[PDB]
Design an enzyme around this catalytic site. Sequence first.
Site, PDB file in Angstrom:
ATOM      1  CG  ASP C  14      40.836 -13.375 -70.756  1.00  0.00           C
ATOM      2  OD1 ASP C  14      41.853 -12.484 -70.404  1.00  0.00           O
ATOM      3  OD2 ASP C  14      39.953 -13.257 -71.350  1.00  0.00           O
ATOM      4  CG  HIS C  16      42.564  -9.156 -71.206  1.00  0.00           C
ATOM      5  ND1 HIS C  16      43.219 -10.366 -71.795  1.00  0.00           N
ATOM      6  CD2 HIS C  16      43.447  -8.168 -71.924  1.00  0.00           C
ATOM      7  CE1 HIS C  16      43.774 -10.191 -72.717  1.00  0.00           C
ATOM      8  NE2 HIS C  16      44.097  -8.954 -72.786  1.00  0.00           N
TER       9      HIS C  16
HETATM   10  C1  CNC Z   1      45.216  -4.116 -71.790  1.00  0.00           C
HETATM   11  C2  CNC Z   1      45.337  -5.306 -72.778  1.00  0.00           C
HETATM   12  C3  CNC Z   1      44.513  -5.469 -73.927  1.00  0.00           C
HETATM   13  N1  CNC Z   1      44.454  -6.520 -74.840  1.00  0.00           N
HETATM   14 CO1  CNC Z   1      45.442  -8.113 -74.547  1.00  0.00          CO
HETATM   15  C4  CNC Z   1      46.721  -7.331 -75.907  1.00  0.00           C
HETATM   16  N2  CNC Z   1      47.412  -6.925 -76.510  1.00  0.00           N
HETATM   17  N3  CNC Z   1      46.511  -7.439 -73.077  1.00  0.00           N
HETATM   18  C5  CNC Z   1      46.358  -6.352 -72.373  1.00  0.00           C
HETATM   19  C6  CNC Z   1      46.951  -6.241 -70.940  1.00  0.00           C
HETATM   20  C7  CNC Z   1      46.063  -6.822 -70.046  1.00  0.00           C
HETATM   21  C8  CNC Z   1      46.452  -6.651 -68.378  1.00  0.00           C
HETATM   22  C9  CNC Z   1      45.567  -6.888 -67.665  1.00  0.00           C
HETATM   23  N4  CNC Z   1      45.885  -8.009 -66.869  1.00  0.00           N
HETATM   24  O1  CNC Z   1      44.323  -6.582 -67.405  1.00  0.00           O
HETATM   25  C10 CNC Z   1      48.104  -7.088 -71.368  1.00  0.00           C
HETATM   26  C11 CNC Z   1      49.411  -6.493 -72.029  1.00  0.00           C
HETATM   27  C12 CNC Z   1      48.748  -8.001 -70.195  1.00  0.00           C
HETATM   28  C13 CNC Z   1      47.498  -8.253 -72.460  1.00  0.00           C
HETATM   29  C14 CNC Z   1      47.870  -9.553 -72.728  1.00  0.00           C
HETATM   30  C15 CNC Z   1      47.161 -10.357 -74.003  1.00  0.00           C
HETATM   31  N5  CNC Z   1      46.369  -9.737 -74.721  1.00  0.00           N
HETATM   32  C16 CNC Z   1      46.282 -10.951 -75.979  1.00  0.00           C
HETATM   33  C17 CNC Z   1      45.309 -10.815 -76.575  1.00  0.00           C
HETATM   34  C18 CNC Z   1      45.342 -11.636 -77.978  1.00  0.00           C
HETATM   35  C19 CNC Z   1      44.446  -9.732 -76.822  1.00  0.00           C
HETATM   36  N6  CNC Z   1      44.233  -8.670 -76.009  1.00  0.00           N
HETATM   37  C20 CNC Z   1      43.283  -7.858 -76.456  1.00  0.00           C
HETATM   38  C21 CNC Z   1      42.036  -8.147 -75.603  1.00  0.00           C
HETATM   39  C22 CNC Z   1      43.944  -6.287 -76.246  1.00  0.00           C
HETATM   40  C23 CNC Z   1      43.125  -5.287 -75.813  1.00  0.00           C
HETATM   41  C24 CNC Z   1      42.707  -4.504 -77.067  1.00  0.00           C
HETATM   42  C25 CNC Z   1      41.686  -3.258 -77.067  1.00  0.00           C
HETATM   43  N7  CNC Z   1      42.114  -2.381 -77.659  1.00  0.00           N
HETATM   44  O2  CNC Z   1      40.418  -3.409 -76.352  1.00  0.00           O
HETATM   45  C26 CNC Z   1      43.857  -4.211 -74.688  1.00  0.00           C
HETATM   46  C27 CNC Z   1      44.823  -3.456 -75.302  1.00  0.00           C
HETATM   47  C28 CNC Z   1      42.913  -3.622 -73.914  1.00  0.00           C
HETATM   48  C29 CNC Z   1      41.889  -4.266 -73.021  1.00  0.00           C
HETATM   49  C30 CNC Z   1      41.368  -3.146 -71.918  1.00  0.00           C
HETATM   50  O3  CNC Z   1      41.743  -3.347 -70.806  1.00  0.00           O
HETATM   51  N8  CNC Z   1      40.314  -2.478 -72.374  1.00  0.00           N
HETATM   52  C31 CNC Z   1      39.649  -1.471 -71.630  1.00  0.00           C
HETATM   53  C32 CNC Z   1      38.542  -2.236 -70.680  1.00  0.00           C
HETATM   54  C33 CNC Z   1      37.727  -1.334 -70.028  1.00  0.00           C
HETATM   55  O4  CNC Z   1      37.673  -2.538 -71.680  1.00  0.00           O
HETATM   56  P1  CNC Z   1      37.529  -4.085 -72.142  1.00  0.00           P
HETATM   57  O5  CNC Z   1      38.388  -4.870 -71.592  1.00  0.00           O
HETATM   58  O6  CNC Z   1      37.423  -4.228 -73.655  1.00  0.00           O
HETATM   59  O7  CNC Z   1      35.928  -4.496 -71.564  1.00  0.00           O
HETATM   60  C34 CNC Z   1      34.726  -3.952 -71.920  1.00  0.00           C
HETATM   61  C35 CNC Z   1      33.884  -4.353 -72.840  1.00  0.00           C
HETATM   62  O8  CNC Z   1      34.392  -5.506 -73.699  1.00  0.00           O
HETATM   63  C36 CNC Z   1      32.602  -4.790 -72.223  1.00  0.00           C
HETATM   64  N9  CNC Z   1      32.565  -6.272 -71.502  1.00  0.00           N
HETATM   65  C37 CNC Z   1      33.642  -7.064 -71.507  1.00  0.00           C
HETATM   66  N10 CNC Z   1      33.493  -8.268 -70.878  1.00  0.00           N
HETATM   67  C38 CNC Z   1      31.683  -8.101 -71.036  1.00  0.00           C
HETATM   68  C39 CNC Z   1      30.992  -9.172 -70.660  1.00  0.00           C
HETATM   69  C40 CNC Z   1      29.559  -8.660 -70.683  1.00  0.00           C
HETATM   70  C41 CNC Z   1      28.413  -9.806 -70.420  1.00  0.00           C
HETATM   71  C42 CNC Z   1      29.191  -7.209 -71.382  1.00  0.00           C
HETATM   72  C43 CNC Z   1      27.718  -6.989 -71.172  1.00  0.00           C
HETATM   73  C44 CNC Z   1      30.133  -6.422 -71.415  1.00  0.00           C
HETATM   74  C45 CNC Z   1      31.480  -6.970 -71.582  1.00  0.00           C
HETATM   75  O9  CNC Z   1      32.697  -4.223 -71.068  1.00  0.00           O
HETATM   76  C46 CNC Z   1      33.822  -3.844 -70.613  1.00  0.00           C
HETATM   77  C47 CNC Z   1      34.117  -2.839 -69.560  1.00  0.00           C
HETATM   78  O10 CNC Z   1      33.871  -1.416 -70.417  1.00  0.00           O
HETATM   79  C48 CNC Z   1      43.033  -8.100 -78.102  1.00  0.00           C
HETATM   80  C49 CNC Z   1      41.750  -7.673 -78.398  1.00  0.00           C
HETATM   81  C50 CNC Z   1      44.090  -7.366 -78.812  1.00  0.00           C
HETATM   82  C51 CNC Z   1      44.138  -7.838 -80.096  1.00  0.00           C
HETATM   83  N11 CNC Z   1      43.245  -7.414 -81.139  1.00  0.00           N
HETATM   84  O11 CNC Z   1      44.820  -8.852 -80.472  1.00  0.00           O
HETATM   85  C52 CNC Z   1      43.450  -9.620 -78.007  1.00  0.00           C
HETATM   86  C53 CNC Z   1      42.134 -10.345 -77.935  1.00  0.00           C
HETATM   87  C54 CNC Z   1      42.086 -11.086 -79.357  1.00  0.00           C
HETATM   88  C55 CNC Z   1      40.870 -11.573 -79.988  1.00  0.00           C
HETATM   89  N12 CNC Z   1      39.871 -11.767 -78.987  1.00  0.00           N
HETATM   90  O12 CNC Z   1      40.725 -11.986 -80.912  1.00  0.00           O
HETATM   91  C56 CNC Z   1      47.638 -11.662 -75.570  1.00  0.00           C
HETATM   92  C57 CNC Z   1      47.558 -13.172 -76.151  1.00  0.00           C
HETATM   93  C58 CNC Z   1      48.839 -10.958 -76.179  1.00  0.00           C
HETATM   94  C59 CNC Z   1      48.491 -10.709 -77.648  1.00  0.00           C
HETATM   95  N13 CNC Z   1      48.726 -11.521 -78.688  1.00  0.00           N
HETATM   96  O13 CNC Z   1      48.421  -9.500 -77.922  1.00  0.00           O
HETATM   97  C60 CNC Z   1      47.720 -11.726 -73.978  1.00  0.00           C
HETATM   98  C61 CNC Z   1      46.898 -12.693 -73.347  1.00  0.00           C
HETATM   99  C62 CNC Z   1      47.016 -12.614 -71.797  1.00  0.00           C
HETATM  100  C63 CNC Z   1      45.932 -13.458 -71.270  1.00  0.00           C
HETATM  101  N14 CNC Z   1      46.604 -14.485 -70.581  1.00  0.00           N
HETATM  102  O14 CNC Z   1      44.800 -13.367 -71.091  1.00  0.00           O
END
Ligand code: CNC
Lengths: 483, 483, 137, 137
Positions: C14, C16
């Site tokens: 991962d 992210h």
């Molecule tokens: C930005 C993003 C996102 N991504 Co990408 C996509 N598209 N992604 C990306 C980019 C990341 C860039 C980077 N290097 O950071 C980008 C385009 C490269 C990418 C890539 C991928 N992503 C992928 C996936 C599947 C996902 N991604 C999402 C996370 C999908 C997200 C969907 C969404 N709308 O949330 C997304 C749109 C927003 C994430 C983000 O930054 N949020 C802002 C951030 C501040 O919040 P956060 O990350 O949610 O974290 C907060 C909370 O969760 C919490 N928290 C998190 N961890 C913890 C741990 C603890 C203990 C506690 C207390 C709190 C937390 O606090 C955090 C801080 O506020 C996803 C939910 C979208 C979806 N609904 O399909 C999904 C995960 C699916 C699931 N779990 O079922 C990919 C396989 C591509 C795809 N199929 O869409 C691929 C995998 C890359 C890899 N090797 O991991």
Amino acid sequence: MELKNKKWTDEEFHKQREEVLQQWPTGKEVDLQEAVDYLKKIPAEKNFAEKLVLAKKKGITMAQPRAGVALLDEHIELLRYLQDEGGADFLPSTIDAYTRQNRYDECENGIKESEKAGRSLLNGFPGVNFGVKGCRKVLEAVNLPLQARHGTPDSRLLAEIIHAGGWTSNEGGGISYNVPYAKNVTIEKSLLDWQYCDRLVGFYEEQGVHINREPFGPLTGTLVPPSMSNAVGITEALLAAEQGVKNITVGYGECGNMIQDIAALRCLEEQTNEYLKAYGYNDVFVTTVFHQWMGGFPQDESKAFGVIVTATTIAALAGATKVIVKTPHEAIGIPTKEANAAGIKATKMALNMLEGQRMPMSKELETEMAVIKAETKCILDKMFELGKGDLAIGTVKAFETGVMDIPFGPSKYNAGKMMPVRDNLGCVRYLEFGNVPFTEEIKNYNRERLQERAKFEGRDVSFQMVIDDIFAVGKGRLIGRPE
Amino acid sequence: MELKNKKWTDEEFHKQREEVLQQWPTGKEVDLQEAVDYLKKIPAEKNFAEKLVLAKKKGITMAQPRAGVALLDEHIELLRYLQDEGGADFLPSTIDAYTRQNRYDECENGIKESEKAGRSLLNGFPGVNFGVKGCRKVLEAVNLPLQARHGTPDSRLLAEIIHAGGWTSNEGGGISYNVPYAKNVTIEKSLLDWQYCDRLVGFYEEQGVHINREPFGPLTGTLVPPSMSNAVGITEALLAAEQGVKNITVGYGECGNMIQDIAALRCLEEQTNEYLKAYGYNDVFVTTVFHQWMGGFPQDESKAFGVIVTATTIAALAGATKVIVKTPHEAIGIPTKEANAAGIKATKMALNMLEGQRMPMSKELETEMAVIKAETKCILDKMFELGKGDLAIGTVKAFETGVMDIPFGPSKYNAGKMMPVRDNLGCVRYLEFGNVPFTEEIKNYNRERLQERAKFEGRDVSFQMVIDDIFAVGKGRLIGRPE
Amino acid sequence: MEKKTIVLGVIGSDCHAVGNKILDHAFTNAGFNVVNIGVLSPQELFIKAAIETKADAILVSSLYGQGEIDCKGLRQKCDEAGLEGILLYVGGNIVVGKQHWPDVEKRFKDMGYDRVYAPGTPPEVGIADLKKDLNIE
Amino acid sequence: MEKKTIVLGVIGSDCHAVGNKILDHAFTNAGFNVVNIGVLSPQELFIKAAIETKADAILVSSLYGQGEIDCKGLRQKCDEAGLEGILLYVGGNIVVGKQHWPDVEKRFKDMGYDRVYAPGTPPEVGIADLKKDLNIE
Ligand code: CNC
Ligand code: CNC
């Protein structure tokens, strides 16, 4: 009464009041002295006129749904849900269609049957039957301004009750709540009865109570050319200002081409202000309302969100003061509270995703605005001519001679000659002009635009294309392209 | 291999191929002679490159989802559903993240666990493990062109297998599939390994087989300024062209201000074509892809449609060749086939509601285009200088010196110094420049735009505003306003 | 309140990174010493950092969906490593797809996680829970 | 097809007119003599038209939602007017809101309607049904 475009005297209005309040026993609940004090105690946050001023001040588009059911407590729960879960900025109360024909007997039966069935058998809130007391219960239960939204040729008693009820806006006008809604009411009669409704607001303004009026822009909701729609709205604004109305929202129904729609709303606002000042109404606060697509919707809910949110984007970029929300249930039936909140949430999300953004000026926009203002002026000029300076009389004569003509209007007083159709970019144009008084230059431009669609589609422009356009959005697209 | 921006010779490329095919036993399924004839028998309707030419010719925006699951039959059923019920114009296969780190052992374990669980425990389709045979089963089961969508620093074997598999597009680039996706891969190594992927497509094109390549525009999806994004895509287009690629889709991720976003996509396409021709690549067919909002989504599904369809409106009016669909499940998890079809239906409805409509030119648009082209040129100019005419060497040196710097990139080779933030109209701007080589004029424009937000919000521009902007869309709005 | 050390990272394949930066920022501002091992971290890196820094808790973020595979086994490895009873938190988007949250939470507690968080959990929730679990609230 | 007469209108306080125009066009094109009484029509006008023109069928459109009230009693009035066995069709959006269609269909058949149509019914379905019911294909 004779019809003239002149403010009713206080004595004239009072005499009509005494007649109108007798039309149902809830008329006895209306006491203008007591109602003024009630209205002045409403907080600004629940005054529709004042919140519109605020929206303009802040450069915000406000969202408002359509909503209403037969029973009072059910209606209240519905509106509270749209307020709280939907995040509405303004609340409606959509009045049922029996009320709209003054059939309070049928309203009463509908209330009883709705009670017995456990669900609403009316398509709105029977405001006259619920009376001032019921209307106040609604206002007291919510925390947003309230507006009657309906389609009523003779709305005099409804207006008395909802305003004494603390509802601080009334939708409608003597053209727009006649021709789309009635078959047998003369234009003169509905203009006279809407002068009453405007004059009542004029009375309230004279006592320091601010109440909004909203001419109904979309009319039949079906391919209405901007210049004809805008001619109606400007006219109703002028007729309202003469009776003393000071806060007016002019409206427009989406046609779907973003530049045409923005041109249309900008022309509407600009020419409404221009005409008001030209005729000496210098203290009128004008706002705009854009209605999301008022034609047939697709049944698929996801597709419906595509229409809702594209419509909202157009409203936002146009700088609309207000946008009326459609729901994913539109093709099927009156939305549940959940479906309506869904539409409101999608709309507000789109508005907030576009905060402060406006369509900048371009040659294309400027060109379409010139076209709409010229077409509109042709129509209004002829109306003033026919009325020998009196716009009310001009309106009656314009309808009689086909100068004003509303597509698909059921009224037998509507000529039914003018026929609209989309051009190759989806702009609504005039296909058949009837007696609409345009110059040849103006007609030429319409034909030139339409010929582009004939060339692209390889068929002549025709009534079949009009049919195709009527079904197109329900079938998944704006323009009714061939099979 | 040493890195230079020069087409690999046939001998050089073959020597690498023999190494690459040994990296997993499915490499034995790749027979280049047999694959050329297989590819040439695919009908044009299923060739990604050819369908893009059509879309361009017709002035159509085509819709494409993201989608992928561990097991072959399940993946086929999913894509058929997106095709048939969703109405997709193009199909992806999203590759799982184990594949992306060349961990085929973990893919295998994942397949076994998914079989046993009755659901996918992988976040994509393990194309290398399924091999050419599995990849062809997918292609033969669908009726649309197929593209690998992923995020893989070393994609050489994957590319061999999916192209021999009849997938006629590969997404990625040596910058865009490193910096957002990896921590420990050098820029030089990913550039070298993406030269392989480009050179393979160059081989195929030399045999008359047309295969599209798509640099990954959105990068980290988080407040990436258009000029930095575009600099990456123009670079990746140029590096691909040198290896013989002839059909390229450059991409851009929505920032949310419609004029900024349309400016960005237009600049991207214009400067891509300009740079290709200036460097003597005169036979490259360039298209564009607009990705709907790549940052966090709201959880509420109605609000999600708000984002999906506003994003689509921007794509449509920009003239994008392709738009990548988000779903109402974005905030929560990989969409079900039904949630994915829902997003595709809303997208296509919006596109069809806007058929042929384009944002016309305005002074605002002209101004923003001039800003973006100047910023972009500044970055590219410095890259060419550092590389003493060689853009591949220039890119390595640009990352080392922070001339190119991608917000929030996990790569340890990314400087992490430049900081973006929105201005008062929501345009993404540069807050902290780091070593991005801008002139003072360019920097001062960014500062002036941001000071307007400070004045409006009554707080100094800061990293707290960046945080607020990261969360804003999830919280219901584009701009992270206080309170 | 008083001083304490956490290991923070994103597990498996991962990449992210945005939430990792926000969590680092937020826990740091709440007064923790955050040992952030970053993205693309295998189990062993969380354990090695926890040993070297004598951490009070390990906060595992998993966003990309393969958390169910990646997270299995950590508690045992921690035990084998001499970190018996260490606090183990997991959050982000820890399974593939929208699922019924009580089932998921149960699933990861059965793997040995002390606390399990749903999509979109604010950092402030985790901070308050850690303060309570460390008796510094 | 062989030439047959229908009465067509929109019942009660309902002003929706566009579908009425399309239905008239479509059934006329199919070879029916359409006696279109238009919108805002009470039951009595449907029956008067059917008598005056010796109609084979009465097609009641109801769009605005109050069809449940408006449509009750028509069959009895037709019988009393001597139109026993006349075909009675109802369609449009005949109830308030989205409802379970089999319940709605039984409710209007129990009221005496021969055929009952859901939202968005194409004119062509009605045309085919009426030819079938009239034995003219
Ligand atoms: C930005 C993003 C996102 N991504 Co990408 C996509 N598209 N992604 C990306 C980019 C990341 C860039 C980077 N290097 O950071 C980008 C385009 C490269 C990418 C890539 C991928 N992503 C992928 C996936 C599947 C996902 N991604 C999402 C996370 C999908 C997200 C969907 C969404 N709308 O949330 C997304 C749109 C927003 C994430 C983000 O930054 N949020 C802002 C951030 C501040 O919040 P956060 O990350 O949610 O974290 C907060 C909370 O969760 C919490 N928290 C998190 N961890 C913890 C741990 C603890 C203990 C506690 C207390 C709190 C937390 O606090 C955090 C801080 O506020 C996803 C939910 C979208 C979806 N609904 O399909 C999904 C995960 C699916 C699931 N779990 O079922 C990919 C396989 C591509 C795809 N199929 O869409 C691929 C995998 C890359 C890899 N090797 O991991
Ligand atoms: C245009 C329109 C529509 N309207 Co008005 C709204 N807003 N409306 C209007 C305008 C009508 C102008 C006019 N005079 O014609 C306008 C704005 C004035 C209006 C007004 C009202 N409307 C009202 C309502 C409730 C409705 N309206 C809709 C019909 C709501 C429609 C929602 C929608 N998306 O469909 C709507 C958007 C489109 C209707 C249309 O013309 N379609 C095109 C036309 C060709 O198709 P059609 O009408 O469906 O008819 C076809 C089929 O149904 C079928 N068919 C119909 N009858 C039969 C009969 C038979 C036997 C057969 C075989 C087939 C049929 O074939 C027809 C021809 O192709 C409605 C479904 C929208 C909704 N979901 O709330 C809803 C009915 C609710 C219900 N049944 O639960 C109002 C009370 C206001 C409000 N609450 O929204 C008010 C009442 C006026 C009145 N007195 O009746």
